[model samples]
Target: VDNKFNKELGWATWEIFNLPNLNGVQVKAFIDSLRDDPSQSANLLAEAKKLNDAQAPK
Candidate 1:
């Protein structure tokens, strides 16, 4: 089962972020890069920071 009801029914959220298949190190890199991207808006960056804090362990 694809379980992708959003696509099946054409019902989805406007807020969406796609991520590549990244292991621990690569995921850390992506979130870190997002943090450094100046083009990203403060609103979106805020969410990234929260995800970074949670995913990137201590």
Candidate 2:
């Protein structure tokens, strides 16, 4: 499942970013944050921005 894949990714990436022990929700939020980071990639940045714009205010 993706949980195990997330575990692998987290193990390699978390300490590099000094992230805390995050649960599933936190992990997803952290990924969303990554998508918002401009230094990451133009595609990711724009994708997250568009997705945020598409989200309902409600």
Candidate 3:
């Protein structure tokens, strides 16, 4: 099984999305939403990256 751990979500929310405040559990939910809808994944990722880029440090 390819069960993604909370730490993975944690890292993704922090490193990828520049979301440092989201807890691991909430990040897991975000990951679930992405995985549950394959068609929206690309759009979601792109949007998230855009938002992160606007707020992330240099």
lDDT of 2: 0.41
Clashing pairs in 1: none
Clashes of 2: 0
Decoy 2 TM-score against native: 0.31
- Each candidate's clash count: 0, 0, 0
Model 1, 1-58: lDDT tens per residue? 5654334222111121222223445444444444455234333334544555555554
Local accuracy of candidate 2 as per-residue lDDT tens digits, 1-58: 4533444433433432332334445445546555444244333334334444444252
lDDT of 3 by residue, 1-58 (tens): 3455444444444443445444455444555655555445445455555554544574
> Would you list the clashing residue pairs of candidate 3?
none
- In order, what lDDT does every prediction score? 0.38, 0.41, 0.49
Better of 1 and 2 by lDDT: 2
Error of 1 at 55 (Å): 19
Candidate 1, number of clashes: 0
- Which residue pairs in candidate 2 collide? none
Leading candidate by TM-score: 3
The TM-score of predicted model 1 comes to 0.30
Off by over 4 Å in 1: 1-20, 38-58
